[PDB]
Design a protein around this ligand. Structure first.
Ligand SMILES: [Zn+2]
Ligand SMILES: [Zn+2]
Ligand SMILES: [Zn+2]
Ligand SMILES: [Zn+2]
Ligand SMILES: [Zn+2]
Ligand SMILES: [Zn+2]
Ligand SMILES: [Zn+2]
Ligand SMILES: [Zn+2]
Lengths: 475, 475, 476, 476
């Protein structure tokens, strides 16, 4: 199919310029001010609109069973929800249990996604335990399964948690094979203790998710894993950065030149922990994720500043909705509320509103934090995350003068609730092109299950490893 | 003239890729892996080399008379020195005296440069005093003389210094007309006192330049002007950032979201203040600039980290050589040693060595800090600072496997001394193309005086002002 | 010969708390011991279950001061009285001579207004509102001849009280040479001026403008600047009314670098938020208008208290300067004309005990530190004051760590329509206040003659600051 | 009845310096006054032009300790002797029981080795090198029955002394419940282990490897971690051998947040740089090998001293643990086998006076603070020790602030081939050292019987830490 996006302003992370885009066979063919095209192309009037690269969501949890609940959205509904939301790539999480096979898990997961995905996708494999079998499977996945990031956890003691001796080996292992070490940095011993301590104090509502794990526990673990990583020479990538404290640790480490990357979520960048104290339990429970939204009023504002600043590089949804019925399995015990929020569809709009409209960052940084930096790190740049010739035609015609008001009653993503209910948004995708096809236009979604493709991710992503390799010379 | 750069790796600030570049009529026509060209083009074998955008030097002082000495290099020798050094644009400084006309100064300066310049150029106008005539001339220069940055000074009391009441008005003035406020941030009252205090203590050698103005004076002024600027809503740009303290102030301000930009010099990023204590007075005096190179051993290393980090955005030469004979007018009084160092030719190589080879930043960040960010801020991006079609053909074929050892006895820039004497460098330009002509090849310079062009700079540079304007809505 | 015995108390000093009796005779503490063998005829005070602390010293009060076209409600009598009922036995006054006017003249007017009227011991700061070499001269006169060892400077109140950087440098140099303490109120005055007009021009005229016009970056800035100046001139610098997290960190940092910085906050800043400037009643919002303003950020008071406990901040004062709502109202249409002043001389000890000690931020011994001892050390009166030992002045309070009183305006003896602490449930109450070895407040009953109190000449070169500084610059 | 009068001195305590005489009888300070009316027969000490300071207390000594397969050169006699000649009148010993072994047994072995031999008063830390509920039990026994109120934990010495985070949490919880002080040596032990093997594998085997293997980020990390743990468990945490700028800032920050953190550095860390690990002679480089190592950055010592003056760091100790060059040499081919130990018990007071007081970083009163008073407060011995007042123990030193001695190994009485301070021109020298109201060192002549010194039971719940903590957690 031939597509021409006429009269737009192309926005990339470096600059915004008046140009048309001509797409043929899944690929951006031309980007120029006035394009001589053979006709019979679908023409899109993009006047007064921005032509941005399609969003990439570096943390989604479609079809994941976590904490005894299975995520409401499968790989179809999830990718669909993404595309309607202006996201044209999603990275999945694979969380194999302790003492189980990473490769087997990866394959189960590929089996669940390939037939069903609407947009391109890739996967993180979680390293939940450590033995010589695991190092082996890591190597296999990188060498020939198109995996270049692994997700580790410093909390979920006795479930996902890794000991410091293990992280050291795991990070060493990642660096050797050219992977990216994603770590979720909370101190798991103190999280375990603080949970029991809170239940024993008679604290059982959703607010306990906060009281049990105050930000010092994040700040601590974050600082620790950065040190480990810096010792092992492994690039470390921090997920779900939730707090001012943790954010500063990251800031500092970066200035010292430590190869630290970092990612927050939409909810963390925009919402406060006050919601855990809302009158309805259901409402409080809808916001339960980890690390939790922080009570301090200034935290969201600050995380957004850091995001604009590149202290935080990437914003993701961490999409993992559960129903209020599902959440309710912890109505009497907060520790049994499964950690998950709904966000895959809201990310682009919510971020545009609070980040761009709110004056914290320009439209170009918005591209940076929503697609470009992701693409660079995943090793897909500029094939994705940029509107230039040769690129994959993952393109969104973005309307900066829109009307939508977020409501759960109109969302196409899973969950009883939307964390952004009633939020007035001026960012809205009008058209979403994925693989050089229009999958969403006029508010109408149209796409076959399985149209999307797994995108093997190449090891040793240039944007992290090229300096590391050089710097290890001077040692 | 038609030029083809065959077999290079094109390096831009975002990525490095194997591509040819075809240039015709001063403009980059094509960038692609295998290019179908009509012959009779000059072919350049760029195999195994990097094809970078030509450097932009945001602070040069050609033909400037400062502190009773006139800079050794005129606009011809300076631009020549740049081009041999891999720099294809220079921004000049205009420092009109107190109670004198900015426009008149700007014209004298244009008169001195236009006939003589080898590469494209632009100018900063210095605002050394403040009255209603000055606001007027500022507006004139922005509106129709292609000026969009002004240089202010917080030191040089009774010469260039501006009072806080004046900075507030000047910054307000800049913001209204869409300019960039470059400030040289040292506390001028304390500098004055500390100079006299040091002379009175019998300290008269070059080391006095340090003892009289320790870094707390920079850190202070820097923090002050950022606050002023943030109050006036004016983007503030810090020049010659010399110190860890000052660097932290900047770091912090940035995280708070304050629209602060910043630039260091090559000497500050790579050399220590120890040189002021060298046995030869001449040698010590060659390094006398302000703010001075700092004694603390860790400062250069740290400024480089910040540079790689984007705490510091831009590296410049601040080229202003003087002869040892000229310097000597302060042999008995250090305060009368004119402030100036030689660097226009060394910048690219010295930075490549300490920054890239030294492992602090990749080749792509190197482009960022040496051309791209400059171009964005000057409002010339991607016309300059990037290798893409449409761009000005300011291109350098950079050799990353070179041999040169820096010596004064072979430099083409002014000065008895080179601050980097004996420094072994692996970065060297093989070819320098300016305005789609080859001006330096095989170690041979070839270019007519006046071939270069003043480049009117457009006000309201998108990279700073687009957020500012939006953010002022939420206020 | 008045004789007093304080039987069965726990003596609390800043170093430790121990069970001891105190015997006082002739204005002086005679004995401190567990069981005391004393000559009779003595007023016995049963201090069982109570703390016997040094009387409070309030390093910033503004009695009888005319400021911003209003005159402080409390004169020197009512003020000192208010202090004593509040557990404060010394107050340091502020003298603010206008620009181009004589410091000495001002100091004397002030002595004239206080000496006949004061109920407790007192001393004065003299404000250096301008600079010529005449001022240097008068500075020297006051130190050498008038018992002054601190001077108060301002970096804001442009065109009123403000000093330029060239002037501060000379002023601080001057202080260091005569052995004085440089108290600076650190806000950037140029940006304060601009931000005030910018806010009025934006149509912001209610009390909240006191905040919008001078956000904490302005304090942080000036604070950092005067510390640098001071460190260059080798002068000990003392920061007043520290109001913000930002400023507080600047101070923290400077201290760790070894810069001779001291610092003081107010009770209101240590305990209250700027949210009060947005209360519905204008009168209420206006009652809290001081500078630098209470900050909106919820965490600020908590943090300043932590710093206080930590010695980032050394001293807590009232900065007592009440005005009536009628008086405040002179800025009903323009917030810049609202006079800067809050009521606090009587609440300081109790409010601080509650939020600081009861609230778990600091122990009872640090509470003495920040309410009397450090003050005494810095004023060069230690251990003559700020400590319960033999030889000390009998400025002593029998403090009830238990009893709770609810603060109300309707029962206070200090001036002001309002109490910033209305309805605040406070632990901590003085039962007895002894000043100059006489009981001036007992059973909730005040009894004292005007003029009973005495100016206390303050000696230059206070050891606690100058001893290091002297060794420092003896050698580089 | 031994009687001593110290005539014509200036008594220096941590709060102030005043001209006073001291009269001692029966191990106790009887009177402190300007002119004293005393019964004769007394040994008179002419202390004119000298300071009469409390005797030093050294919170970290390792006499008779066998560590890393070497036994410390000084036994309890030579050690305490070395202390006294150095102006130190109390030492706190370290007891390091092996993993799975009894703390009480270890404590007793140690008491057995010290009681008959010690010249000055002493106490002990017990090291908690492992964790089961038996250990909790023994902890309780030692506090309740054996005069122990501090325990020493390690986050490094993996497989030797190291404790896991789950264990620290329980250990700290345990300490807080029995009212003890948790001393932690904070380096990340996993990264230390790895970095040591990584350095040996890189062919790095000289003393400099002690630095390369454990750069300061490892200290900063562990330090930050144990403070968090401690703050969660509500236990007061006390950091030992603080060696780095990074670590120091972590501590600074934590303190400002109000976290109940205390901290101690060593003399070597406060005054010397890691450049010594690169000296040509291996023996010399090896003499400085301790942990955490002296840091290469030139600014570190200067900064730690500033922090010490500032109370970011509270206490300075020797961490005395000499070994001979022959002994050190057991790691001539492998730096990881060089035993960690430096000589310092005798130099501490003089070296600190020189760099701290003479050098202008802190006054004479802070010098007492960091060398005796704070120690005494934390050990729960204040003002029985660490202060010259009546009732106090007569652990008193007549300190000569003037006299200069040049430090050499060839004249020291402490153990070790080497002095880290060789050739250092030091002001500051004790002329007379009185321990237990007896003169043990005068005229450069030591005179004292083995066993004259006494173990001093240390009471739990030291007020200076626990009084706030108790109020804190009584309320949230
Ligand atoms: Zn390996
Ligand atoms: Zn809610
Ligand atoms: Zn304007
Ligand atoms: Zn040199
Ligand atoms: Zn002088
Ligand atoms: Zn209110
Ligand atoms: Zn318990
Ligand atoms: Zn050495």
């Amino acid at each position: 199919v031939r597509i021409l996006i006429k009269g737009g302003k192309v926005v990339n992370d470096d600059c915004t310029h008046e140009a048309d885009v001509y797409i043929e066979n899944g690929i951006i063919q031309q980007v120029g001010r006035e394009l001589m095209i053979p006709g019979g192309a679908k023409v899109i009037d993009a006047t007064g609109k921005l032509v941005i690269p399609g969003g990439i969501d570096t943390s989604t949890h479609f079809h994941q069973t976590f904490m005894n609940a299975t995520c409401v959205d499968d790989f179809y509904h999830g990718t669909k929800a993404a595309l309607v939301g202006g996201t044209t790539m999603i990275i999945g999480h694979v969380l194999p249990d302790k003492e189980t096979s990473l490769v087997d898990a990866y394959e189960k997961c590929r089996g669940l996604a390939d037939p069903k995905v609407c947009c391109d996708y890739a996967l993180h494999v979680g390293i939940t335990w450590w033995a010589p079998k695991v190092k082996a499977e890591m190597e296999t996945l990188v060498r020939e399964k198109g995996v270049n990031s692994f997700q580790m956890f410093m909390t979920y003691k006795d479930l996902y948690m890794l000991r410091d001796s293990e992280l050291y080996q795991v990070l060493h292992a990642c660096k050797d094979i050219g992977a990216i070490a994603r770590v979720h940095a909370e101190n798991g011993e103190l999280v375990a203790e603080g949970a029991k301590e809170a239940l024993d104090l008679g604290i059982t509502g959703p607010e306990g998710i906060e009281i049990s794990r105050p930000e010092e526990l994040e700040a601590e673990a974050t600082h620790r894993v950065i040190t480990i990583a810096n010792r092992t020479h492994c690039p470390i990538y921090l997920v779900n950065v939730s707090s001012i404290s943790a954010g500063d640790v990251i800031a500092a480490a970066k200035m010292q030149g430590k190869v630290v990357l970092a990612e927050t979520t939409t909810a963390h960048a925009t919402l406060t922990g006050l919601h855990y104290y809302h009158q309805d339990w259901s409402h409080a429970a809808a916001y339960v994720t980890v690390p939790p939204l922080r009570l301090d009023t200034n935290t969201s504002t600050y995380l957004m500043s850091l995001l604009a600043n590149d202290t935080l590089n990437i914003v993701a949804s961490d999409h993992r909705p559960f129903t209020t019925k599902q959440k309710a399995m912890g109505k009497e015990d907060f520790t049994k509320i499964p950690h998950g929020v709904s966000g895959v569809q809201d990310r682009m709009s919510v971020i545009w509103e609070r980040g761009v409209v709110g004056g914290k960052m320009d439209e170009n940084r918005f591209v940076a934090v929503t697609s470009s930096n992701a693409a660079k790190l995943l090793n897909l740049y500029p094939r994705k995350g940029r509107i230039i010739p040769g690129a994959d035609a993952d393109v969104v015609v973005w309307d900066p003068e829109a009307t939508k008001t977020i409501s759960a009653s109109t969302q196409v993503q899973g969950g009883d609730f939307n964390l952004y209910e009633n939020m007035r948004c001026h960012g809205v995708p009008l058209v979403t092109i994925s693989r050089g096809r229009v999958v969403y236009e006029n508010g109408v979604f149209m796409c076959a299950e399985g149209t999307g493709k797994f995108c093997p991710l190449r090891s040793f992503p240039d944007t992290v490893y090229k300096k590391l390799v050089q710097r290890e010379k001077t040692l």
